[PDB]
Design a protein around this ligand. Structure first.
Ligand SMILES: [Mg+2]
Ligand SMILES: [Zn+2]
Lengths: 95, 37, 621, 681, 229, 229
């Protein structure tokens, strides 16, 4: 199947929450730029024509791999709706 | 052709958000700036 | 009609994993055309978008670099597949495409059950999730390997089908051969020696009804696990033979095959001791033993870990199936001699009924109704006859193992080849007076055929008319039930239903335990309305009762401590449009509590519409 | 009532030539009622097959008639029956109406007979629709033949007798879908009507009276009768069948040859030698492979493709009209206005494509030209044209190209200008241009083959002759059929054919097992006995005995109960063989397959590929004018329907967006699908 | 040598032509004949190379589905007959040889009617190409090549003459392999494997030659286990 | 080299001890991984020589089913434990070596309690032979030999001492072989064989060493096809 799916399911209160989180996370992973991730370091996304998944294959496979770590935070009302898109634009550049 | 009332279309999860600790600090730096003069 | 779709003939993809499915590259191409176009541009293959388009307008103009591109685009994306009548949610599952050459679409064997699909030409359609969200849901909650347990019953649907069982079975069943002289090893030391040499001779088999150890156990003892199979490889012991082996702790008298099965699972999931806990190597492994294996593996080890074992079983089953050399042969359908006697016995028994009528004793009718019960009994007699034959003389008959294995075979079917199929009904419904004495093995004659034909069409026409009504039943059930959805917080209205464990009138009035299955149907994954102290354990209030708990309550009622059970149910929910977590229960496709937001309404409506196609339909009212 | 002839193959057309439908005038039987009509009635005997009806909604209402069943002057299916006078049977056959048949006590042909005598005291007969055990003194009439009970189409089945009437239907209908193979073979085992099917049908070309052969062209056999006269008999070389199957008459008689009155001069589309032939007899092992034959999959040996065994020629006519528009006639020329001459190569004759040209998807089959926009097309694009290079020829490229899916080689073309022959062109129609194209369809994994019994299935894998199951003597099996498909369904007849076949292979002979009187288990075990000597006899003389493997499998055979313990391996294998199964080694390991496995000459045909077969796949494409939903077109495939049942499937899951997608971006969201595409891009 | 090494596989051969060749090898320890015979068989059928008709050119015919007058056999039958034609060249210098043939009138055309070529030999002389009645024209150019395996006419595609038509490639020289492992008796220990594999060949190459190539492909493959990583 | 020869079997290894060792080798043309893996396996289990306990002698015990007092473990368990004992001699001169051991009283007997032998080494020292409480007699003579494959105690039969009991022969240092043939992708042609065979070993020899021996036994055997007759 797909990496720690159970581990993932366990993080959320609802199944359908783990779908919303990953989907929205993948959204922004493209929009603000792709390096928005929190895990470029030692071991991260990879593909083999050459190992280059490091740039833009599957957004969603990333989101999950990050969410499986404890860096992201998904709340019902975490950060004010419009003001986020503004500060994310400011900090994450190749749009 | 509207979103389904049931599923992800749940009002329970329609609205959800994700943030990196990096943007966490950024958003309240915005709040710190709220201090006038 | 959807914009990114496509359909072709499907074909079994044995090596393929649950996870994936083989999709024709040629199809992937115009399927993922726009997605390819830009990665074309992202790499030197083409300067741009319109360039890339004309670059692919023809077939001969494709550089093999393009495939490399397409394959790269499809890296972690998944498509949806859909069979002919979509009857339940699983009638559409998601998988990872593994581009392949040719026209046909490679489908995994295990999911062939979910979509009723055989490979006689059934074609499956395929769609593509375009938004990042659409794919998110598609592979998280709609991929195949994530939905292993049925929404109808908390019983596995990824159950080793026709071949896999057949295989996994043959490897684990033990054999028995000849009792000529004494079978007493249990006590004499002269018995171990004498019957060890006598076995060396031609009188005692390696497999003999000796109660503690047949000389087969006497001769061979294997220290380490591997040791056992090596001897097998060298032609010392066959897999189905009875020998003695040493595991983690005690000397276990178990055959080679059964010991190998152990490893297969033990390896599938490495938690070797957790592998031994949930398996029964004490028996040949039927579809049920496996179905159970899957289930508990699903509850104990985890979803994906389960998927693994599934393909693991799939692979060895298929393999060992090929080697076993099981094959149908005219001589394999064995006709019991007993047939001639049971026939001849009911034969004269008919003469008497005619001798009775010829006198004036029995009414026109009485004769008829008496002759029919003559056959209906005689026929059922030959049927236990044939099986007993196989049971005692040919444990490994080809025809028979498929039937006794979760694999292909029906008791009333075997009867038409080895025994005989005899009573066929007239056009109207009044069965025929004369039976069909022949079997399929021997010439079903000219007439007996015609006679049987009548009942054929009524069934064929029945399937066609119910086939559309299974659609009838569903529409009506979804029209009423669609709005119903799990939206909640434990609805506070505690009004509950009590599930009976005993039935009144089968016989006038005697109280008795309801059917195991039925009871499971009533309490599985339910939420206890009020606490119940039963056999020693204190079932907590609101606790979701696992299958294991519904197994305790039954043993308890067996003992005599409970006759009903307090459980929250949709029948009594407060939430006007909707149903809550506590009132629904467990069964999401997952065996955990129901997740808020599941479209229960439909999930229900479907589970009742599909089976519907199996129920007889003569006239509505 | 009148419909396209179905000539997938002759047998077919024959059937469609004589099938009695319910539905029609409307006065007789509309579809509303049916269950009483749909069922088989006691009278349907010898009058209508009980097997031929169509699987599906329309069942029991549409059906072909029986073997001898014939319409007396006014439409009452009656049939032939002999006259048995006392305990004496006769040849005077009475074509008896349906009604008169009830007045007499009729008997079945299966009744032991010496010539004119009836041989057993209690012997079956049937008064009126009801089976009755009558005495030789009451037998007034007897059945002509078991054959008159069913239809032609069914009578072609070997041991119909051992097959469940339900899946024998499948067998009957399957032959109706048999595709003519360049290499046609008759069945190793036939019923007996193959011969008269091709003759009553008009497949092969027979000889009027006796004589000798003058010329034997690939296109004509001018025979010369002994009457002092000679006639030229043309042969429909390669003709298109309404459905697209090849109908070629290919000679079978050499120059200067004796001709029997009524002897095959040329064979029909599918006849080998006057015999009906569809599909080819192939040696088959009946066991389980990896999963390659899991529910109903067929594993095939590459070796079958090496030989030109399952191969069939196809042909399709592409047409295009030169239309008369008020904007200017659609010229049909070699001129293709906008980009390359590389495409014009095969457009040899100016305009049409050259014969013998290899046309692949997307090549110009024909070219035509129409005008677009009114005088001033694009204000922006007119600028671009002035800029980069003013090459102004305002005509549009509307040219018949090869639709996706495929074409082959062009074999014939027809160009009917406005109308001077004796052809009337439709109004507006300036001229028509057809282009017949043909192609070879090799056997491949997508294809579907099925024996006459009913075993239907699709090729899942083409294995290298290198590793599939091979017999002791190096001859390997061509196709590996999965046992499991035999118990559920009930047609042992296929397992009986395979057996009789095994004999026919080593005995180099073919047989004819009638419908219910044919071969009988002892006679077949007998032929196998003769076979054992050709298979193992030569083995003795050639120099060698039995393998370690061969003995090993015998060990797992006696422990099984197929061989009488104590006998010798050469005697044990004979036993084993008589049972129809022989020892087989893996091929991919050399080791043997624990336990004997049956193998033999089973006849298997290949089925016709519908226009569906064409694996559709669509990205983006046309849309409908009023309802804007994806629409199948000339150079783009057309979308798949997402129906209610499929909606609920997703509804059931939490697929919220995926379902929204299916209803918006992918099908109806006009602005959606556009911004969708671009975004993806 | 005298004891363990002199007791060595006695390679014995029995070859009667280029088509059949038996090969016995007899003391082999335990389950070795199998270990040997099987791989060799697998090699013997897939890896050995040979010759096959790769292209054809009838001078007045344009497509493969054409019927030629005076000729009883249609192009599809003839091109088929050619597939069964077996040729043999003697050296690498001969990669692609074009055989030529033209027969007019009343004679039955056979494979030997092809004009001889220096280093090429036709083992299939009496094969039947066609039957010409009178005014029977037949002028064809058939290309022959040396390759391996099966190659569909659709995969290569010939380019001799624009009106020529490709044909399917039937390359393996080996027709069938068979190997038997029967016990043999050696002084004190009876358990012994005896491998005798029988090879059949179209004639292009010989059983012995085939086998030799076989064993080398195996050896070459066993060397590929040299540089770890 | 660059095209067909540089595209050569990339022999990759993953060995993490002397017991387990993976071996991958891809691209292999068609159905070759199988043609290779199968024989090698067959060799890996039968041909590679080793050492196993072939005979035992307890001084007061007469039959194998005897129970010895003071000793918690019955003869059948101990003779079983001995099958798990792995020894290694350094040279041919050592065909049959008899290891000796006697322990009295309260100590737990282990494989190291065996009196050392000049050219023999016990790799299985801490293995557990038995538990002696007090007045515990234990004087045993265990015969060790070097052979190949599996040999049932019934097939050989001990002749050391009349009261001795034979043991089943655990010889191949290799415990289990496994080879997988999964497809691999190479540019143009997809059909490709990838062979990765996993070898397990008791520790005596190594997976790599085993495999190498294996391949040579095959090669050596391929040469026995040299002198016809
Ligand atoms: Mg089907
Ligand atoms: Zn509630």
């Amino acid at each position: 199947a797909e990496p720690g799916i159970d581990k993932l399911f366990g993080m959320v209160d609802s199944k359908y929450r783990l779908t919303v989180v990953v989907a929205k996370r993948a959204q922004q992973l493209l929009r603000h730029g792709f390096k928005n991730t929190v895990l470029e370091p030692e071991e991260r996304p990879k593909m083999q024509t050459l190992e280059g998944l490091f740039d833009d294959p599957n957004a969603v496979t990333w989101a999950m791999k990050e969410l499986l770590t404890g860096r992201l935070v998904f709340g019902e009302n975490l950060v004010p709706e419009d003001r986020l898109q503004k500060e994310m634009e400011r900090l994450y550049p190749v749009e | 052709g509207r979103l389904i009332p049931a599923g992800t279309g749940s009002d329970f999860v329609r609205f959800t958000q994700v943030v990196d600790q990096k943007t966490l600090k950024a958003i309240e730096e915005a709040r710190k700036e709220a201090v006038e003069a | 009609r959807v914009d990114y779709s496509g359909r072709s003939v499907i074909v079994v993809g044995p090596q393929l994993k649950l996870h994936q499915c083989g999709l024709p590259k040629r199809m992937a191409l115009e399927l993922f055309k726009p997605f390819l176009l830009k990665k074309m541009e992202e790499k030197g293959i083409a300067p741009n978008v319109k360039a890339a388009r004309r670059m692919l307008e023809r077939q001969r103009d494709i550089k093999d670099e393009v495939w490399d591109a397409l394959e790269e685009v499809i890296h972690g994306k998944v498509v949806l597949l859909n069979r002919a009548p979509t009857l339940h949610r699983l009638g559409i599952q998601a998988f990872q495409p593994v581009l392949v050459e040719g026209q046909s679409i490679q489908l995994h064997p295990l999911v062939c059950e979910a979509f009723n699909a055989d490979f006689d030409g059934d074609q499956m359609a395929v769609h593509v999730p375009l938004s990042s969200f659409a794919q998110a849901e598609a592979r998280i909650q709609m991929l195949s390997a994530h939905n292993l347990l049925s929404p109808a019953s908390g019983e596995p649907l990824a159950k080793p089908s026709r071949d896999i069982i057949l295989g996994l079975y043959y490897i684990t069943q033990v054999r028995k051969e000849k009792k000529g002289a004494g079978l007493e090893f249990a006590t004499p030391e002269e018995a171990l020696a004498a019957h060890e040499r006598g076995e060396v001779a031609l009188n005692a088999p390696i497999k003999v009804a000796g109660r503690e150890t047949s000389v087969g156990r006497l001769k061979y003892v294997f220290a380490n696990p591997d040791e056992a199979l090596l001897a097998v490889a060298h032609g010392i012991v066959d897999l189905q033979d009875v020998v003695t082996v040493r595991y983690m702790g005690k000397r276990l008298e178990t055959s080679p095959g059964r010991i190998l099965f152990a490893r297969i699972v033990a390896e599938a999931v490495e938690d070797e001791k957790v592998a031994w806990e949930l398996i029964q190597l004490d028996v040949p492994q039927e579809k049920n033993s496996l179905k159970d294996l899957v289930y508990q593996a699903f509850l104990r080890l985890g979803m994906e870990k389960t998927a693994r074992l599934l393909d693991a079983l799939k692979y060895y089953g298929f393999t060992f199936s090929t080697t076993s050399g099981i094959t149908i042969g005219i001589d394999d359908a064995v006709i019991p001699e007993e047939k001639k006697q049971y026939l001849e016995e009911a034969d004269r028994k008919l003469l008497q009924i005619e001798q009775a009528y010829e006198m004036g004793f029995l009414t026109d009718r009485e004769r008829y109704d008496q002759i029919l019960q003559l056959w209906t009994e005689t026929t059922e007699k030959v049927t236990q006859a044939v099986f007993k034959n196989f049971e005692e003389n040919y444990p490994f008959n080809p025809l028979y193992v498929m039937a006794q294995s979760g694999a292909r075979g029906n008791p009333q079917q075997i009867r038409q080849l080895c025994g005989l199929r005899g009573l066929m009904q007239k056009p109207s419904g009044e069965t025929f007076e004369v039976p069909v004495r022949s079997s399929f093995r021997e010439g079903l004659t000219v007439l007996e055929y015609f006679i049987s034909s009548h009942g054929a069409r009524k069934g064929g026409a029945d399937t066609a008319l119910r086939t559309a009504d299974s659609g009838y039943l569903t529409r009506k059930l979804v029209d009423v039930t669609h709005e119903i959805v799990v939206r909640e917080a434990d609805c506070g209205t505690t009004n509950y239903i009590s599930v009976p464990l005993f039935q009144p009138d089968e016989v006038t009035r005697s109280l008795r335990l309801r059917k195991r299955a039925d009871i499971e149907a009533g309490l599985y994954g339910r939420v206890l309305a009020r606490e119940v102290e039963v056999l020693g354990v204190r079932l907590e209030e609101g606790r979701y009762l696992s299958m294991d708990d519904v197994h305790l309550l039954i043993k308890a009622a067996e003992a005599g401590e409970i006759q009903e059970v307090p459980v929250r149910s949709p029948l009594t929910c407060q939430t006007r449009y909707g149903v809550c977590q506590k009132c629904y229960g467990y069964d999401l496709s997952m065996a955990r509590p129901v997740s808020i937001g599941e479209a229960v309404g439909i999930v229900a409506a479907q589970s009742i519409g599909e089976p519907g196609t199996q129920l007889t339909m003569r006239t509505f009212h | 009532l009148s419909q396209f002839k179905d000539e997938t193959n002759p047998l077919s057309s024959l059937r469609h030539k004589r099938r009695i439908s319910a539905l029609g005038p409307g006065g007789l039987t509309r579809e509303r009622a049916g269950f009483d009509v749909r069922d088989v009635h006691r009278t349907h005997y010898g009058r209508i097959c009980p097997v031929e009806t169509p699987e599906g909604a329309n069942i029991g209402l549409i059906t072909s008639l029986a073997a001898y069943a014939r319409v007396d002057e006014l439409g009452f299916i009656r049939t032939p029956y002999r006259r048995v006078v006392g305990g004496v049977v006769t040849d005077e056959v009475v074509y008896m109406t349906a009604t008169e048949e009830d007045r007499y006590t009729i008997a079945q042909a299966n009744t032991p007979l010496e010539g004119n005598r009836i041989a057993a005291e209690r012997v079956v007969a049937r008064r009126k629709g009801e089976p009755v055990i009558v005495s030789p003194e009451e037998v007034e009439f007897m059945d002509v033949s078991p054959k008159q009970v069913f239809s032609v189409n069914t009578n072609l089945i070997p041991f119909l007798e051992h097959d469940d009437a339900n899946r024998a239907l499948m067998g009957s209908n399957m032959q109706t879908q048999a595709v003519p193979l360049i290499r046609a073979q008759a069945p190793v085992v036939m019923t007996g009507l193959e011969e008269r099917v091709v003759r009553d049908s008009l497949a092969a070309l027979y000889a009027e009276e006796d004589g000798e052969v003058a010329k034997v062209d690939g296109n004509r056999i001018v025979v010369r009768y002994e009457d002092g006269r000679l006639v030229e008999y043309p042969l429909r070389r390669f003709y298109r069948s309404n459905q697209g199957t090849a109908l070629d008459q290919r000679p079978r008689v050499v120059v200067g040859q004796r001709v029997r009155k009524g002897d095959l001069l040329a064979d029909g589309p599918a006849s080998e030698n006057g015999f009906l032939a569809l599909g080819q007899n192939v040696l088959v092992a009946i066991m389980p492979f990896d999963g390659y034959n899991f529910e109903d999959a067929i594993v095939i040996s590459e070796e079958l493709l090496k030989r030109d065994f399952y191969t069939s020629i196809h042909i399709e006519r592409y047409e295009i009209e030169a239309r008369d528009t008020k904007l200017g006639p659609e010229r049909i020329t070699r001129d293709i206005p906008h980009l390359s001459e590389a495409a014009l190569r095969d457009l040899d004759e100016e305009g049409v494509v050259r014969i013998g040209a290899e046309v692949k998807p997307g090549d110009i089959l024909v070219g035509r030209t129409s005008f677009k926009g009114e005088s001033e097309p694009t204000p922006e694009e007119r600028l671009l044209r002035s800029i980069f290079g003013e090459k102004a020829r305002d005509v549009k490229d509307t040219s018949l190209r090869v639709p996706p899916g495929e074409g082959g080689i062009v074999v014939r073309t027809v160009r009917l200008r406005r109308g001077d022959p004796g052809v009337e062109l439709k109004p507006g129609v300036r001229e028509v241009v057809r282009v017949y194209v043909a192609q070879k369809r090799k056997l491949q994994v997508g294809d579907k083959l099925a024996n006459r019994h009913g075993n239907k299935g699709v090729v899942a894998k083409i294995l290298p002759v290198e590793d599939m199951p091979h017999l002791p003597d190096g001859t390997p099996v061509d196709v590996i059929l999965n046992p499991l498909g035999v118990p559920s369904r009930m047609n042992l007849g296929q397992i009986l054919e395979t057996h009789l076949g095994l004999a026919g292979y080593f005995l180099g002979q073919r047989y004819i097992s009638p419908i219910f009187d044919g071969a009988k288990e002892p006679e077949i075990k007998e032929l196998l006995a003769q076979a054992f000597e050709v298979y193992f006899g030569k083995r003795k003389g050639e120099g060698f005995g039995v393998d370690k493997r061969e003995v090993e499998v015998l060990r797992r055979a006696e422990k099984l109960g197929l061989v009488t313990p104590g006998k010798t391996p050469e005697e044990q294998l004979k036993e084993l063989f008589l049972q129809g199964k022989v020892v087989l080694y893996d091929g991919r390991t050399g080791e043997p397959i624990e336990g004997p496995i049956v193998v033999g000459q089973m006849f298997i045909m290949k089925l016709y590929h519908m226009v569906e077969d064409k694996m559709h796949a669509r990205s983006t494409g046309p849309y409908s004018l009023i309802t804007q939903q994806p629409l199948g077109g000339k150079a783009q495939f057309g979308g798949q329907r997402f129906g209610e049942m499929e909606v609920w499937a997703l509804e059931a899951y939490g697929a919220a967006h995926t379902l929204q997608e299916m209803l918006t971006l992918k099908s109806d969201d006009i602005e959606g699908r556009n911004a969708a595409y671009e975004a993806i891009i | 040598m005298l004891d363990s090494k002199l007791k060595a596989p006695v390679f014995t051969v029995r070859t009667q032509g280029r088509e059949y060749g038996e090969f016995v090898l007899e003391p082999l320890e335990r389950g070795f004949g199998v270990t040997l015979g099987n791989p060799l068989r697998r090699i013997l059928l897939s890896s050995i190379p040979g010759t096959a008709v790769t292209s054809v050119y009838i001078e007045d015919v344009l497509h493969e589905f054409s019927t030629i007058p005076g000729v009883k056999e249609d192009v599809v039958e003839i091109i088929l007959n050619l597939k069964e034609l077996v040729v043999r060249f003697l050296n690498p210098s001969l990669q692609t040889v074009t055989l030529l043939l033209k027969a007019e009138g009343p004679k039955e055309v056979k494979a030997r009617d092809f004009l001889p070529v220096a280093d090429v030999e036709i083992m299939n002389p009496d094969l039947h190409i066609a039957t010409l009645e009178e005014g029977g024209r037949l002028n064809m150019e058939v290309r022959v090549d040396r390759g391996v395996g099966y190659v569909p006419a659709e995969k290569h595609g010939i380019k001799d003459r624009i009106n020529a038509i490709p044909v399917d490639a039937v390359f393996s020289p080996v027709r069938r392999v068979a190997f038997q492992v029967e016990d043999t008796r050696l002084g004190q220990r009876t358990d012994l494997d005896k491998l005798t594999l029988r090879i059949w060949t179209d004639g292009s190459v010989t059983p012995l030659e085939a086998l030799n190539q076989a064993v080398e492909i195996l050896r070459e493959h066993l060397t590929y286990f040299s540089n770890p990583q």
